Amino acid sequence: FVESVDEYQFVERLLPATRIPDPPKHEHYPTPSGWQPPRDPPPNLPYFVRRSRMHNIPVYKDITHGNRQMTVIRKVEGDIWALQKDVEDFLSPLLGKTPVTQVNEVTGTLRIKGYFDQELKAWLLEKGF
Amino acid sequence: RSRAYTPPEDLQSRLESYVKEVFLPSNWQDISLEDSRLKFNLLAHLADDLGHVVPNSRLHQMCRVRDVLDFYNVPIQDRSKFDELSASNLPPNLKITWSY
Amino acid sequence: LTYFSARKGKRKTVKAVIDRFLRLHCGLWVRRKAGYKKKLWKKTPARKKRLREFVFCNKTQSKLLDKMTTSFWKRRNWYVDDPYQKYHDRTNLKV
Amino acid sequence: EPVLRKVELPVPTHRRPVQAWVESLRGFEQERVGLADLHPDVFATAPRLDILHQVAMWQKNFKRISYAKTKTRAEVRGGGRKPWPQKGTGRARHGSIRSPLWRGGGVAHGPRGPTSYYYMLPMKVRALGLKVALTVKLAQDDLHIMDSLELPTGDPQYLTELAHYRRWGDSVLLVDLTHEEMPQSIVEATSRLKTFNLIPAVGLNVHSMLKHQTLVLTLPTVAFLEDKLLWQDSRYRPLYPFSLPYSDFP
Amino acid sequence: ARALDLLRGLPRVSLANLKPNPGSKKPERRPRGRRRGRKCGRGHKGERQRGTRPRLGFEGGQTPFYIRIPKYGFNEGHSFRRQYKPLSLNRLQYLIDLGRVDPSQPIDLTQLVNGRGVTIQPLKRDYGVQLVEEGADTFTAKVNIEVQLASELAIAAIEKNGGVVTTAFYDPRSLDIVCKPVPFFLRGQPIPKRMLPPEELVPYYTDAKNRGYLADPAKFPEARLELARKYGYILPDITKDELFKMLCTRKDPRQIFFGLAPGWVVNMADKKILKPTDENLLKYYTS
Amino acid sequence: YRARPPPRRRPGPRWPDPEDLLTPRWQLGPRYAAKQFARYGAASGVVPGSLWPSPEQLRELEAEEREWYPSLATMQESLRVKQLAEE
Amino acid sequence: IGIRLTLPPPKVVDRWNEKRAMFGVYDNIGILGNFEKHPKELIRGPIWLRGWKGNELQRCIRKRKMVGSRMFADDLHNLNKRIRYLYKHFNRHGKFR
């Protein structure tokens, strides 16, 4: 009425994974999508900006009230005020005036007024974050 | 036992002697102890001789032997504020009493 | 509307709305004009064209209607070839 | 003979590993027998005492079932008839003897039924709460490690005297790995006392360790905590609860 | 590690010291005082004051605005209109690069979801994925992809780099089993056999110009060549490559998983698969 | 104060005896038994053959399939007929 | 007059009792217990709100449909009356609508 066989490997191909896997290497970065791993040994600046659980640069667009455009540089740790100096210097010649910043050294985060997400993603890339 | 500790001057020389037992290369004050076994040996010797063991929250700040020397050159006044207020040679018109 | 159903204890929709208005996921509500299949024999041709055009809803109307339905109807819906899906998003929006 | 340790999991390449002594209990005057390193992002996280507070208030108000009931206007006996006609007397109009005004009546807005105050914080916030609590317990010279919660004999006087000799505090929270492995010596010596609390490692919490002033883990327990609490970071969006089988999880 | 240095001095953290963040707890308003409550906000004596004003939508007895305007079926059959969660080529390339969906093996829907690349709700009528033309250029991968609908630009982008696309239909129950295979194996049931499309979809999955799983396989190459000579890229001839055996693998209709037959019971407690060995059953499932 | 032994799932299959009138109806049919086997296997579970449809159950299932789930020979024929009629 | 004249006997609270010395032990049985359990299933109390929160109306509906066939007659009549009233109130009374 029944027979017990062992070709269970296919079943084991269906069980998902919990841990994100460390992505595999490439002979020429960036990959076609745009990824670029974090430079090793780490860049020498006072601060650091960790990368997300699936390896992107933590710059995040944001909105409130339907007209407060904002950006958030999130997983900083170190002299965040150094990072405020850096980002203010970098953004000044783009807008035409210094950007209105808000630092939060408790959460280790920073934020800026006005959509600059892709600019800062590229900017933190070429510093080695 | 008590906490109070004041840095002996000969401590300086003592440190080097202890380092000699567990390391010959000069510039000795800038030895790096990231090898954990040697760090344990040195710190245990300093603790058992000088009667003052490094705190857990300060054991990572000191990665170079210069930091061991720097930490051991700070004193600790193991006394409540009663004793320091009393020892501050108060003016004639001030009297403090402490019911303990 | 019923803010708490007696059998489950959830909100409820005014089904007079679902058969009257269409949800564009950005927030807009599009409807039809009133008078568009009635007495089309004395309405001048320009009036016919106007009454045949779809039309949006004022802000208070949109908020009222959003209150009159639940969270199922305010949902990103990926239909196969719906003729409205290019309107489910705004672009070049300047407050 | 020295007893060492190395961080098992990966360490990010811009943080050295923190370290802490490994003090035994086989004798009174035997601390600093060993030296262990601990992973940075479970014993060196940013302080974030606010998240600590959120977790403590979650642990207070989520088991809480308030058993308070007060008979409303309709469940206090009697009360049908009008006590007296409407227009006849100059007396104030009243349509029941149990309205909230009248003595012995009901309560207009009182505790209704057995209420639950249950809410669940995202599990990453609770993992981060354990991280913060351990980090703060280490930065304040309060956290201690031990190779094994072993004693020579079971008298509570020994444990209390030892806790007095090393200036631990007034209350110690000893943590061991599994409830079935704790040696009989510590079990005996700690059942009697009030301020010395054993815990199998499955049951740390913000409240249990903020209550106490000394958190005495073990080498197995720090390995365990590192494993689970780090696993809470670098984990996938969950497809279904982890009670069910997963390829790589257990 | 400066904050820990500060904490080394400050007194012990305990439950007497903690506080919320400055801004979380907006303070509570209760009607007591000359400001908060004398009429407690309810206004003068009216019908707002007593709490009894007409249900939401009323308009003072003119015809309600949501009843003047006509009734057109913008949402007529919406409960049964089929839905499809897009999987743009940008997103497929992304998931290929970071190692989340392995492209050596076939990319089924179980793999797209066990890499958490696209999540499709079986309920709410989402039947499956759909490849879409977005960032077709910059797509570069040898991927054997099975989806539930496709656009010919996407088949161009996937075949041009030497790939096989085969559209495939799943039923609601079949889909709910595909997305979440482990909980289904926890139900104890034997695997069902997935069912052929409804009437109005069979033209879609039997024509080779949509890479159907029920079209004539001998009608593929002329379609592929027509596409290649429509988008100006030279079609690669697959059968040389080392991975042909993977790009030739394909589960046949009436099958959900690859190495598993409709009718097998998946015992996960001791790692076994149980099979039915009675003639009537084995003819029922194999059909 | 050795804390209380930690809570656990009851280690084994739950077989509620069918005498007591409190055993909920859903915890007595075959569905629950199938779930018990799927979870804990034949280690402490049931006789395996019960998982598949019984012969009369099979016959009614096949009747349902034959009624509502046509074959694409039939479906293609229906499409061709409708196409000719529309044309 | 609304004030007393003798201090009450000073209550002794043993802050290091059993049930105060463990408040929260196993309150993280999931994040570090292989997720076998859930804190939901550690909280004792009524069968109809072991791990659930709602307003009064929803709470009484749950009490009815989950234990409203074992509860005494007069209590059950009070409960049905309470549902009727809270329905009327929540659905026809208030400032916001």
mmCIF file of C-alpha atoms in Angstrom, chain A residues 73-74 76 78 80-81 84 101-111, chain D residues 48, chain E residues 21:
data_model
loop_
_atom_site.group_PDB
_atom_site.id
_atom_site.type_symbol
_atom_site.label_atom_id
_atom_site.label_comp_id
_atom_site.label_asym_id
_atom_site.label_seq_id
_atom_site.Cartn_x
_atom_site.Cartn_y
_atom_site.Cartn_z
ATOM 1 C CA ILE A 73 21.891 58.529 6.693
ATOM 2 C CA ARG A 74 21.260 55.909 9.285
ATOM 3 C CA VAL A 76 26.675 55.818 11.384
ATOM 4 C CA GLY A 78 31.673 57.607 15.473
ATOM 5 C CA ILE A 80 28.835 61.951 13.489
ATOM 6 C CA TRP A 81 29.639 65.669 13.633
ATOM 7 C CA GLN A 84 27.798 66.524 9.262
ATOM 8 C CA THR A 101 20.711 69.258 8.759
ATOM 9 C CA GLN A 102 19.645 67.388 11.861
ATOM 10 C CA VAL A 103 22.051 65.110 13.693
ATOM 11 C CA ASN A 104 21.008 62.500 16.239
ATOM 12 C CA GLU A 105 24.050 61.064 17.970
ATOM 13 C CA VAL A 106 21.815 58.889 20.158
ATOM 14 C CA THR A 107 20.509 56.666 17.361
ATOM 15 C CA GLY A 108 23.734 57.364 15.486
ATOM 16 C CA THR A 109 21.818 58.857 12.559
ATOM 17 C CA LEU A 110 21.670 61.996 10.463
ATOM 18 C CA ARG A 111 19.140 63.599 8.170
ATOM 19 C CA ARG D 48 20.354 53.479 23.954
ATOM 20 C CA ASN E 21 12.607 59.303 24.718
#
